[PDB]
């Protein structure tokens, strides 16, 4: 029984297709078939300048958007060999790890729902909204934020981003624990 | 009687015709479920209530599911698979069917007796004392049969 777990449905994840070679009770093989979102970054980016490219890097991954951005930024900075002032690298780690938390939260939120029943999704999301709101303050927008501009970030940290960050740093320990 | 009686016995027989004529296993088997309901009703009407309820529970609720599972399991889209030298034998078969009723019919106009005893409605209260009374042996025989069936059944299907 080679079964066709189709585009998304009926297990409602991604757009992966898996040809499950199944005896009946015993999983033998999955033949994965990909190619359902090949929208070709590798081509497209060859027709846009370097400033513009910083806006195509968070459009690939998205659960962890900023990491692509960060990774790309570094690669260029390195290439033409010009420093990053120290505060820049500080801001960049604060955001980088903040986006990382954002990603894990969405990962555990979806997973638990995926198989398992409903509830743990919402708490994992609840916290995620707060992170996105924090992000909102500093870069002007949610995920798919463009804030690196080679050599550093493009605006200061506002006055208000540090107070609100403090709020969220108090809560998170207790909050993580309830997922455990 | 014969106002209502007619209805139930007509239904029963009619249903009977269906389960042996029709094409396709599922419609067939399903007809037999309508059968066993009617028959259950007829039990109740004849002061055997307990037996009635068991008719539904076992024969129509356990058994036919097993039937359905087999005909689903191995498919069945023809009640008339292949063609083979058996074709003329349809009328001799239908002949003999009449015959086997005929001789039995004859027999039953041969002792005709009173229908006139009580039964208590057949409630399981009043069946109990008999069942574990002197029929207790017969019962344990039953019990042995089931166990044998399970073990046999396994040995056929799974290698092991």
């Amino acid at each position: 029984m080679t079964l066709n777990v189709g585009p998304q449905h009926p297990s409602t994840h991604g757009v992966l297709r898996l040809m499950v070679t199944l005896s009946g009770e015993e999983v033998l093989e999955v033949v994965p078939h990909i190619g359902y979102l090949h929208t070709g970054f590798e081509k497209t980016m060859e027709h846009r300048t370097y400033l513009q490219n910083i806006t195509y890097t968070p459009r690939m991954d998205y659960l962890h958007s900023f990491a692509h951005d960060l990774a790309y930024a570094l690669a260029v900075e390195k290439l033409l060999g010009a420093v990053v002032p120290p505060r820049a690298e500080t801001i960049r780690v604060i955001l980088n790890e903040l986006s990382r938390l954002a990603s894990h939260l969405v990962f555990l939120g979806t997973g638990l729902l995926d198989l398992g029943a409903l509830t743990p999704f919402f708490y994992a999301f609840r916290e995620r909204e707060t992170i996105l709101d924090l992000f909102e303050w500093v870069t002007g927008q949610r995920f798919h934020h463009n804030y690196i501009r080679i050599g550093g970030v493009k605006e200061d940290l506002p006055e208000e981003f540090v107070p609100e960050l403090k709020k969220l740093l108090e809560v998170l320990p207790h909050r993580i624990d309830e997922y455990e | 009687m014969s106002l209502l009686e007619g209805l139930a016995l007509f239904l029963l027989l009619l249903s009977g015709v269906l389960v042996v004529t029709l094409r396709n296993a599922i419609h067939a088997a399903l007809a037999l479920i309508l059968n066993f309901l009617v028959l259950a009703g007829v039990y109740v009407a004849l002061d055997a209530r307990f037996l009635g309820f068991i008719q539904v529970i076992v024969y129509a609720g356990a058994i036919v599911v097993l039937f359905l599972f087999v005909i689903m399991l191995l498919f069945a889209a023809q009640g008339e698979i292949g063609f083979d030298p058996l074709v003329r034998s349809r009328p001799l078969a239908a002949l003999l069917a009449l015959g086997v009723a005929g001789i039995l019919a004859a027999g039953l106009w041969g002792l005709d007796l009173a229908f006139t005893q009580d039964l208590k409605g057949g409630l399981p209260q009043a069946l109990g004392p008999l069942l574990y009374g002197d029929w207790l042996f017969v019962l344990l025989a039953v019990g042995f049969l089931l166990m044998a069936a399970t073990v046999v059944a396994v040995a056929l299907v799974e290698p092991g």
């Binding site: - | 001789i103 039995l104 004859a106 027999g107 039953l108 041969g110 002792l111 002197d134 207790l136 042996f137 017969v138 025989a141 039953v142 042995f144 049969l145 166990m147 044998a148 069936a149 073990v151 046999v152 396994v154 040995a155 056929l156 092991g160």
Partner: protein, 427 residues
């Protein structure tokens, strides 16, 4: 009890069989039967009820036989699941129960108890052996419906569900006719015989042994309690003895030949039922059981699969003792005096003649001469030029059994007045 040993061992052994090795379960099951046999001997002639179960003259004799057959068949086979003993054990119990009752519902329950494990035992998965299995199950299941329908009209004609109570006009006549059908099929009285040629060919040899002894015993046992009309009997016998013996000339596959033979012997045995007896059938079946038991042990020693007629030839070279055994057997089933087979025939025939049914008894005898074609067709073929075919000689185990059977056979030939005294029908 006898029942006690069987039931206990069977249930206990059921779960037990996981721990023990398959040889050890063959060891266990052999012991069990033998104990059951022990208990039979030491309680002989004390009729004992404890329920609908009722040990009497008939029971004792035929369950001796049923147990006998079961001991033998369990001997020969090496399995791959403990279950191909376990199911046989069960089956033995079923046949024990069949004889030792007289109440119709026990009889039904018994009929499934003996028939069910037989269907499964028809499988060593040989492709033929599935075709075989199926035929038997469907024909069996048909007879299930008949025998059950028979009982239901019987209860109509009489207050009893036990066999015994006056009997009436037409309905009682009717009811008794449909009961002979069911039982008939199990003993292979024609014209229900149809499965007996296919299943005997299809099933693996040791199994066929079991059917050709035990089921015939058991079947007859219960049959005897039926007060069968003298007309019914006469029909059955004629059809059995004619179709059986004539058709058997045409066959040329050893087991299937013996299948046809095993219709004929049922036909002769059913004569005994006229006045009813339990001494006549006791003796008869004793000689039949031994002879067939012997014979099929020998066929197994040839090969596990369909034995072409020629395969028998040269048996005397291969081993002398075994070759002679099979000879003695074949003459015994033909009934050439002074062998025990003759006495078995004679006693049955004597009950027919007392009953005064002449014609039947003549017909039977004429075609019983016919029977010599194929019986000698085996028995002499033994001595000719040795064949180049598969064979093996088996242990001293098997030698002792086969040769025991053949001496025991002709021993009862000369001295039937040993056993006959104490095959009493009352105790």
């Amino acid at each position: 009890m006898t029942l006690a040993i069987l039931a206990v061992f069977s249930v206990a052994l059921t779960l037990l069989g996981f721990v023990l090795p398959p040889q050890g379960v063959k060891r266990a099951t052999l012991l069990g039967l033998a104990l059951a046999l022990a208990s039979l001997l030491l309680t002989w002639g004390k009729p004992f009820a404890f329920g609908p179960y009722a040990v009497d003259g008939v029971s004792q004799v035929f369950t001796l036989l049923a147990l006998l057959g079961a001991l033998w068949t369990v001997g020969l086979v090496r399995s791959g699941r403990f279950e191909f003993y376990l199911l046989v054990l069960y089956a033995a119990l079923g046949m024990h129960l069949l004889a030792s009752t007289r109440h119709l519902l026990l009889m039904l329950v018994a009929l499934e108890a003996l028939s069910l494990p037989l269907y499964a035992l028809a499988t060593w998965r040989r492709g033929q052996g599935l075709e075989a299995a199926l035929k038997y199950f469907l024909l069996g299941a048909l007879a299930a419906a008949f025998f059950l329908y028979g009982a239901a009209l019987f209860y109509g004609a009489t207050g009893s569900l036990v066999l015994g109570a006056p009997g009436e006009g037409p309905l009682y006549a009717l009811a008794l006719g449909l009961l002979l059908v069911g039982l008939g099929f199990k003993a292979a009285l024609a014209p229900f015989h149809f499965w007996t040629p296919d299943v005997y060919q299809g099933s693996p040899t040791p199994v066929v042994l079991f059917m050709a002894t035990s089921v015939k015993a058991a079947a007859f046992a219960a049959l005897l309690r039926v007060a069968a009309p003298p007309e019914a009997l006469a029909l059955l016998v004629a059809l059995s003895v004619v179709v059986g013996n004539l058709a058997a000339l045409a066959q040329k596959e050893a087991k299937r030949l013996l299948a046809y033979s095993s219709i004929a012997h049922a036909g002769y045995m059913a004569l005994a039922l006229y006045t009813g007896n339990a001494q006549a059938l006791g003796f008869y079946l004793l000689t039949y059981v031994l002879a067939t038991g012997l014979a099929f042990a020998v066929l197994s020693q040839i090969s596990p699969d369909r034995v072409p007629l020629e395969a028998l030839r040269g048996l005397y070279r291969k081993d002398p003792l075994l070759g002679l055994a099979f000879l003695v057997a074949m003459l015994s089933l033909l009934g050439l005096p002074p062998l025990a087979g003759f006495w078995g025939k004679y006693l049955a025939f004597a009950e027919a003649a007392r009953a005064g049914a002449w014609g039947v008894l003549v017909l039977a005898l004429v075609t019983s001469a016919v029977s010599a074609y194929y019986y000698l067709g085996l028995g002499l073929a033994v001595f000719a030029r040795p064949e180049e075919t598969p064979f093996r000689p088996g242990p001293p185990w098997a030698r002792a059994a086969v040769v025991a059977a053949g001496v025991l056979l002709l021993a009862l030939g000369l001295l039937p007045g040993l056993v006959l005294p104490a095959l009493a029908a009352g105790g």
